[PDB]
Curated annotation (Swiss-Prot), chains A, B:
Synthesis and degradation of fructose 2,6-bisphosphate. Testis. The active site is at D92, C122, A220, E289. This is 6-phosphofructo-2-kinase/fructose-2,6-bisphosphatase 4. GO terms for cellular component: cytosol. It comes from Rattus norvegicus.
């Protein structure tokens, strides 16, 4: 049974924000998910600016168009889940009345889906008025609109909804599976989680927040095997590596951060790097570098020479193919699900890790496709600072002023199985 | 910061049941946890039978003894978290008033703990009458007590609480971190989860239930390597394993179970065993047998001969010591946490797995210590039926009438490092 997640809530309550986060997360863990924004359907259709009058519960051309757009989107939900093999569809609309929700529920019922509701009720001033100055900012609806008039219009638009707004009821909606999220995550009300996927969605939703904070990601300092062009293993830091540790520690202080939690893997290179900090760290084996299996501690020349076909295949699909007894980047992603969860839940946090692991975490916060993830640039002695914002995440690359080797191998233009060794290793960075 | 879980609710609301499941779960995942039942403190202090009068709001003698039992328990909570190195303490008492909960909360505050409340609510009388028949049955309080009088007395005891009962309020208790469980876990209210452990506790509590059902555990049938006395690998079924598959299918039918979900690992022996039932199934790599690393596909004789230091060590701490590039039973336990979660969430379920995995799962439901876990007996072609009950889990061993080899190796009396090889392999079951 595919799942139909139905957003419920007044405009500017974070329904879309939640819809995007949930959709991105689900896709990241490999569940084909797609969001359907009814407002976008409405914009892409009328093409002409509309005032709040169009949202009035008595307007004809308005109620007509809005219901048609809801049906258009629902038709695409049907196609995605029933025809394209999608697993979860997120239907982003106010859906503030029991009749509309009953309508949508029956739709799901008839098409063989399981419906689950997600209501967002924001009440805190620094959220409502806070989302407006983002609606008023990035919304196509208020482009080239006088500030005071746009702000006023939107307020009357929310009013068009408050008047008939029927929030999910403990008794009247006992039989529905849903979650009510208050004040962007302070409290929650959960009812009738029907299955495994819903239990995971709930778990995720109850762990995200919008508290300002930053996520710092960096690899351990250059190690002995980084110098030799060797992958995997458990080397200690190189001299220049220890030098970086000292630089990270300074950077961290200069940053002046409220309650920084530091995490490292169980590999010496990260722990050693962490020892330079003042703050105590927490080591987790789940953060360990991607296992190369049989190709552990080898160089690329050695892999090509010993495992020539697997090297070519990995080059063809670096996301899905693994070395013998090793992991794929796909595997790594499954392994890091608990890290993604904790990072969502954390506030200010520094993660000292490795190249593959760091690519995965960066792909998550910057929403990079699986195919592009195994190739993201995560240089040594460089600190990636991630600051979550509305719909996105700002990234700042901060080189900590200490040279280091290039462990980054681009994909060669020739990824053929029959290719010669020269072309296979032409992108291999200089080492030793 | 150790955590202080404070149970809240009227008598016969499942506070204790929840306290024991939560305590067992937390310990299983390696978080030193201890529950403190205030009623047991009361029973041990007084020794003599007490009518409802003893619990009266005005009974001066009883108000005092109950106050001495509450503080006694709290002093032990303090000793455990602050002196014994415990991580989580579950304070099991009614704690039905705002003023009481604030006293407890201050205690936690002063001792450097984080307080989290778990309220269990039940306003359904058949459920209460059903529960009482467990209180009236297993409670030391109503031993040798006339049924109608016991039942009556307990009802008046609940009233001693209902009258002053102030449930956790959305507004009044806005600053408290808590979870309210309603309709025996149908709905929930969660407020201010403060950290990672609370987030995991919430996740766990929202996924357990008391819907009657059974958990069936059995290994895959005898395999080619079982015959050879070889551990690990990915062998197929032996002629007997196939025969068992045919026996398990029959047993499953004879059982006449409602909606049986079947799970297997990604190893052929389990899948092949599953292929013989009348119902479909799902496979999971998380269920794969414990990784022996370098000692994969080896025999015990071979392990003693090639890695003597490790066979002796693993023999010393079979829970914590691992083979090189392999897992420890401790690691397996961590790996199976998502399996524990799902099994709790499931109703009627059959898991076709392996020896080490089945030991871990059996240790969870039967609450066997980590030190005893790596040694539980899980014979081939033998089905272990687990039926969860109040505070425990009933276990029925069902041999499916098909002979098989012994893969069970008792801990040899000599586990001394540098021990003679004949003593090291004396408990090795005959094979080939
Ligand atoms: N969420 C729940 N709601 C209702 N009953 C439950 C819940 N969880 C467990 N039970 C049942 O409650 C019974 C166990 O009750 P018990 O734990 O003795 O209650 P209690 O609140 O600790 N009473 P007391 O110790 O007398 O104050 C069993 O029959 C369980 O199946
Ligand atoms: C940290 C110290 C906790 C003090 C616990 C006070 C125990 C008094 O017991 C009280 O009994 C009353 C009727 O008998 C009930 O109504 C109250 O809920 C209960 O708290
Ligand atoms: C930087 C990332 C920090 C990760 C914090 C990990 C907290 C506990 O990690 C836990 O490990 C268990 C098995 O080991 C898994 O089953 C759980 O899903 C995972 O949360
Ligand atoms: C003993 C059998 C229990 C099997 C447990 C299966 C665990 C589910 O495994 C995976 O977990 C991921 C975590 O979010 C989900 O996203 C995936 O959909 C799910 O398949
Ligand atoms: O996937 P790629 O690009 O080969 O990079 C991964 C390698 O990078 C390293 O982190 C160091 O170069 C190795 O541990 C790892 O195998
Ligand atoms: O951990 P123990 O008791 O030595 O035995 C576990 C072994 O049992 C088996 O399941 C079969 O003998 C192996 O796969 C596994 O390695
Ligand atoms: Mg109790």
């Amino acid at each position: 049974c595919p799942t139909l997640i139905v957003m419920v809530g007044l405009p500017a309550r974070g329904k879309t924000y939640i819809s995007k986060k949930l959709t991105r997360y689900l896709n990241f863990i490999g569940v084909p998910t797609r969001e359907f924004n009814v407002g976008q359907y409405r914009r892409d259709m009328v093409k002409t600016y509309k005032s709040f009058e169009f949202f009035l519960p008595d307007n004809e051309e308005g109620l007509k168009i809005r219901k048609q757009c809801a049906l258009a989107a629902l038709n695409d939900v049907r196609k995605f889940l029933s025809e394209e093999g999608g697993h979860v569809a997120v239907f982003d609309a106010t859906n503030t009345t029991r009749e509309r929700r009953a309508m949508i529920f029956n739709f799901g019922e008839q098409n063989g889906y399981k419906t689950f509701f997600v209501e967002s009720i924001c009440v805190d001033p620094e959220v409502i008025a806070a989302n407006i100055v983002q609606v008023k900012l990035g919304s196509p609806d208020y482009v080239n609109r006088d500030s005071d008039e746009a702000t006023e219009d939107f307020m009357r638009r929310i009013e068009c909804y408050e008047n008939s707004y029927e929030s999910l009821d403990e008794e009247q909606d006992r039989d529905l599976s849903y979650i009510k999220i208050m004040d962007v995550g302070q409290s929650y009300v959960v009812n009738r989680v029907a299955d495994h996927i819903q239990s995971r969605i709930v778990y995720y939703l109850m762990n995200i927040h919008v508290t300002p904070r930053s996520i710092y990601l960096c690899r351990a300092g250059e190690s002995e095997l980084n110098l030799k062009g060797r992958i995997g293993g458990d080397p200690g830091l190189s001299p220049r590596g220890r030098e970086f540790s000292k630089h990270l520690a300074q950077f961290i202080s200069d940053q002046n951060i409220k309650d920084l939690k530091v995490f490292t893997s169980q590999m010496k290179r990260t722990i050693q790097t962490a020892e330079a900090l003042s703050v105590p760290y927490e080591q987790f084996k789940v953060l360990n570098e991607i296992d190369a299996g049989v190709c552990e501690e080898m160089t690329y020349e050695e892999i090509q020479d010993h495992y020539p076909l697997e090297f070519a295949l990995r080059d063809q699909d670096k996301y899905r193919y693994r070395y013998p007894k090793g992991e794929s980047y796909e595997d790594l992603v499954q392994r890091l699900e608990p890290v993604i969860m904790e990072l969502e839940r954390q506030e200010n946090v520094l993660v000292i890790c490795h190249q593959a692991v760091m690519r995965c975490l960066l792909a998550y916060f910057l929403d990079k496709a699986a195919e592009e993830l195994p190739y993201l640039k995560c240089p040594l002695h460089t600190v990636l600072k991630l600051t979550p914002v509305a719909y996105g995440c700002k990234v700042e690359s901060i080189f900590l002023n200490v040279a280091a080797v290039n462990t980054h191998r681009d994909r060669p233009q020739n990824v053929d199985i029959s290719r010669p060794s020269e072309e296979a290793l032409v992108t291999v960075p200089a080492h030793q």
